[PDB]
């Protein structure tokens, strides 16, 4: 009666062992959170709805109204809840118009109780056939914000409705066990407090560098298990490939009686492109194929009658389409002994052995948590699974996502068991148990290629054995009462208590032993091989566990022997891990139960957080892990991946003013002849790290770039004077602190390095004063993410050199044209690095060339230097034939990037050719630190305030011209570096004097002007405006908050009594919002009428423009040549305003509506513009609504990610969105009543404080609505109490908040004197409860700062 079940999968998990026992799925409920279903499919069946946990609609909808749930409903007797959480209850489809549905394939594993054949002829079934499947659809996008709250209420829904276990497909690599996402952990811990198991896959990134190279032996912390599975409560799942693949597969009758290779049937693969099965699949062929090769002994890794000689894929034996196939050595590549090869190609499907069976699935996650805890927890198949696809179709897989549902089913079944067998067991202790049985009853997997046991860090506590878990009544724990043991740090001896637990009323007796493993290293490459070495099995004996009882035995081991060999191979520590194995002394193969352990010989706390500086590695002739030594010697292109400093380049020109800049480059590097950036060296053979904070945009600042090996936090940049050897008086600290992840590079979407421009240093002290030239330390410090760790530093030697090298004189011999300059002398500590002579080769009548990039709409201007060879004695044979002498320039170059350039115009009248001459050289200040066109004349009727002024380009991307302007009204700056109203400065009258001129910007709150938040540096005269220019920043150099500040000018030089100015400057940087206006047609031409602009406030409009751009040279922009240099500009043609209030948009000579622009500028200088074609896609009947977040922070350090749902006046989601002015946050809707709901945002960075539902009506009169969700920012800090001596037992450490509440603190595993927590920014008192007279002493208070780490040095007293 057609029952044929595939058990390729149930066989070696022992599924039937718990089925026949009456534990099928029935009665329990598994909540699958994933991307969709097709819940009518054959498989979502349950027989005997009368034994289920939920009867029908009446039952379900009634539980919904007792919990407080208004959405979603039952469908089947199997699919009992649904809710498409992407936009608050849609259908769960994921259809086409492959046909794969990842989300149901998942469920297919857990409960696919089908009754019909797949393409083999088998009836596939899930681990729990008869459990009921509430489904929450939830799946994250990048445009979104933080998907978390979606999940968090899917979890909360499952729990209140009453599920028993949730299969959560959600992964964030390198998770931590204790400091995960706080609202998500507690949401889970609430499921665990009910009868809920939370089963989460563990990831597919596998280990640090998995897409580059195996990890170096010096960096043992290569694990990537992800959050939330890294949670203590949930059960993380790794994956082992299945032994049996179901696949479309190629056949050959010529080897049909071989049975070595499935009787001819061999497995093929098709690469990144060009799956040519639409090219002759199902019909026999000849040798006329693309048989790749063997490729190895056992890899399986990826005439002539199609003679296309395909190396478009080969590319190294000793994507362009010919024919795609990958076959392994035996499979045919040896079976090549007639060459005739009749080759059918799968008109059907087949069942075959997996080329990687029983192997551990390359991608499965691994390693410790980020805070050093042992996860995953259990392995299950995943691998090449077969399961429930779109509609009546069947699986495929390879993915940890497929393993975790296995455990779901298992957790279901085991729970049944426990309910039956231990019904005095409360829902408080249910789920940890169903786990602890699942883990302790499992077969330690054993790596087939090595015949060693696979590391616990890769398999948890072994492969899933469900029978063993329901037929034993035995589980195992360590001290933490957890199914594994995370020992933390490890000395010469490892000692620890294991404890075996017995549920049955039949006491048992068991012999045990301990296998101890470590990490195999390839000794020729010094990299881990990701395979273990058995070191020694230690046996310990046997003991007896009472019936309904426990017993506590003590493993102990001495590992002194291995320490010299291991510690040699693995200098920075190494893992010592393994299994305690437990069998019945009588009848060996009964009561097989095991517990995995791991510990670290060294200090896992203090492993290096960042890969060493590229400069230091090259000084040791070592190299970076992701570095690419391809190119000239010492070629550190800033694009490459490493740890160093970056800075910004700007060439020096002698015919015009530079217009542009080279962009970023690695500090200490300089461009050689061929344009390769090279790490040039000083006379002692070192490179030099020197910046030149002069305002010329050549190496003005220095910023840290790192390749991090572990998750970091607390990272900041400080600058000390190098005399300050202990680093105890910082001269400057980066104003932000920084946290972030390993650069693990699982694939191209994961960065191999991260540049932190927030660490940029500019030779300014903490007070804005300039730090004098000298020798300094730029210390980048940080912390790994394990409580107690020591704070790692990384010091860079850095020179401030702001002085050009010397140009005194040179000796010229006219007989040979010999130019000997002198010995090279630099001013300052940078040192000279290059000597040069060039002349200006005129081309097209100009000494420079003007390149116009028409794709970036960018213009760059370049001196036409040509060089004069340097001879080894340091002199220059000038080609007098190719340009005059004295139109040769001599150029000497700093290391920090100052540049001296003399023209030979420091000359004597004719003299041409007599005899050797001594020749004076003077620097022409060709490198100048560009300043702003003044052209202003001040008069007593003026405020004396001046600011700067500039337009905003619409097409070209050069920096638009700007000039100083007066400011006698409208005291508002937008500090946005656009050249328009970016600062307040003070200019004085020409015939007046201003002695001891000092500007101080005081805060709002400072009634007495006691403590400036910004001050002018010493030497600030009313003529140097820059010295009084306030770019709306603090002394330390971060942006002030939008608002009002007092700007106070004080000069003494009224030749006696002095005065004080005091203007109220207001800071605001908000792009004004352009609404759509009307478009009417008068006479035969288009007439555009903008809506009326209001002028109240800082964002009130004071310029209104309609214009269009004429095509001049096929360009809409244009270069204009002056002595002032070249300037770049749009081809703006303005349109006068009619009295109508309209502007007249004439359709001129091939000028289009997309080249007319509306543009506005508010009282603070912010500027916005739209195109008239955009502003017209609004119908005349239609309105526009724009949603946005109101953050009280500068409009560059603000979220821009969130999502919303607009509902029509009936509550239906609006459909068929049309966006306005190219903003995904602006919709065009017909007139009516609407309601918007803030769905997701980065709940990490911000907290919503206004209503999350807003109503609005769009109407003829209100045809533009802004709705704004108001928010508040979130700052976290880390706090760590570090004690003198370990605390006496029964002590309790806590952080006491200023409201008065207590945050409890746990002792840190890897540092046992340290108790710490990540906390919300504020003020805390460390509070300790000591059981005796004990009295902890010394400075328990702290006021944290954002992203900082705070240590407290407390002492236990007697
Ligand atoms: S599953 O949804 O966790 C999964 C498995 C494998 C991949 C690609 C890695 N080769 C993605 C997702
Ligand atoms: Ca400079
Ligand atoms: Ca110092
Ligand atoms: Ca210098
Ligand atoms: Ca501005």
Automatic annotation (TrEMBL):
<dbReference type="InterPro" id="IPR015500">
    <property type="entry name" value="Peptidase_S8_subtilisin-rel"/>
</dbReference>
<feature type="binding site">
    <location>
        <position position="893"/>
    </location>
    <ligand>
        <name>Ca(2+) 7</name>
    </ligand>
</feature>
<dbReference type="InterPro" id="IPR010435">
    <property type="entry name" value="C5a/SBT2-like_Fn3"/>
</dbReference>
<feature type="binding site">
    <location>
        <position position="978"/>
    </location>
    <ligand>
        <name>Ca(2+) 8</name>
    </ligand>
</feature>
<feature type="binding site">
    <location>
        <position position="826"/>
    </location>
    <ligand>
        <name>Ca(2+) 6</name>
    </ligand>
</feature>
<dbReference type="GO" id="GO:0046872">
    <property type="term" value="F:metal ion binding"/>
</dbReference>
<feature type="active site" description="Charge relay system">
    <location>
        <position position="102"/>
    </location>
</feature>
<keyword id="KW-0720">Serine protease</keyword>
<feature type="binding site">
    <location>
        <position position="801"/>
    </location>
    <ligand>
        <name>Ca(2+) 6</name>
    </ligand>
</feature>
<feature type="binding site">
    <location>
        <position position="982"/>
    </location>
    <ligand>
        <name>Ca(2+) 8</name>
    </ligand>
</feature>
<keyword id="KW-0134">Cell wall</keyword>
<dbReference type="InterPro" id="IPR019931">
    <property type="entry name" value="LPXTG_anchor"/>
</dbReference>
<feature type="binding site">
    <location>
        <position position="698"/>
    </location>
    <ligand>
        <name>Ca(2+) 4</name>
    </ligand>
</feature>
<dbReference type="GO" id="GO:0004252">
    <property type="term" value="F:serine-type endopeptidase activity"/>
</dbReference>
<dbReference type="Pfam" id="PF04650">
    <property type="entry name" value="YSIRK_signal"/>
</dbReference>
<dbReference type="GO" id="GO:0006508">
    <property type="term" value="P:proteolysis"/>
</dbReference>
<feature type="binding site">
    <location>
        <position position="603"/>
    </location>
    <ligand>
        <name>Ca(2+) 3</name>
    </ligand>
</feature>
<dbReference type="InterPro" id="IPR000209">
    <property type="entry name" value="Peptidase_S8/S53_dom"/>
</dbReference>
<keyword id="KW-0645">Protease</keyword>
<feature type="binding site">
    <location>
        <position position="235"/>
    </location>
    <ligand>
        <name>Ca(2+) 2</name>
    </ligand>
</feature>
<keyword id="KW-0677">Repeat</keyword>
<dbReference type="InterPro" id="IPR005877">
    <property type="entry name" value="YSIRK_signal_dom"/>
</dbReference>
<keyword id="KW-0106">Calcium</keyword>
<keyword id="KW-0732">Signal</keyword>
<feature type="binding site">
    <location>
        <position position="974"/>
    </location>
    <ligand>
        <name>Ca(2+) 8</name>
    </ligand>
</feature>
<keyword id="KW-0964">Secreted</keyword>
<dbReference type="InterPro" id="IPR023827">
    <property type="entry name" value="Peptidase_S8_Asp-AS"/>
</dbReference>
<feature type="active site" description="Charge relay system">
    <location>
        <position position="401"/>
    </location>
</feature>
<comment type="similarity">
    <text>Belongs to the peptidase S8 family.</text>
</comment>
<feature type="binding site">
    <location>
        <position position="225"/>
    </location>
    <ligand>
        <name>Ca(2+) 1</name>
    </ligand>
</feature>
<keyword id="KW-0378">Hydrolase</keyword>
<feature type="binding site">
    <location>
        <position position="700"/>
    </location>
    <ligand>
        <name>Ca(2+) 4</name>
    </ligand>
</feature>
<protein>
    <submittedName>
        <fullName>Chemokine protease C</fullName>
    </submittedName>
</protein>
<feature type="binding site">
    <location>
        <position position="696"/>
    </location>
    <ligand>
        <name>Ca(2+) 4</name>
    </ligand>
</feature>
<dbReference type="InterPro" id="IPR046450">
    <property type="entry name" value="PA_dom_sf"/>
</dbReference>
<dbReference type="InterPro" id="IPR050131">
    <property type="entry name" value="Peptidase_S8_subtilisin-like"/>
</dbReference>
<dbReference type="InterPro" id="IPR013783">
    <property type="entry name" value="Ig-like_fold"/>
</dbReference>
<dbReference type="InterPro" id="IPR003137">
    <property type="entry name" value="PA_domain"/>
</dbReference>
<dbReference type="GO" id="GO:0016020">
    <property type="term" value="C:membrane"/>
</dbReference>
<dbReference type="InterPro" id="IPR022398">
    <property type="entry name" value="Peptidase_S8_His-AS"/>
</dbReference>
<feature type="binding site">
    <location>
        <position position="694"/>
    </location>
    <ligand>
        <name>Ca(2+) 4</name>
    </ligand>
</feature>
<dbReference type="Pfam" id="PF06280">
    <property type="entry name" value="fn3_5"/>
</dbReference>
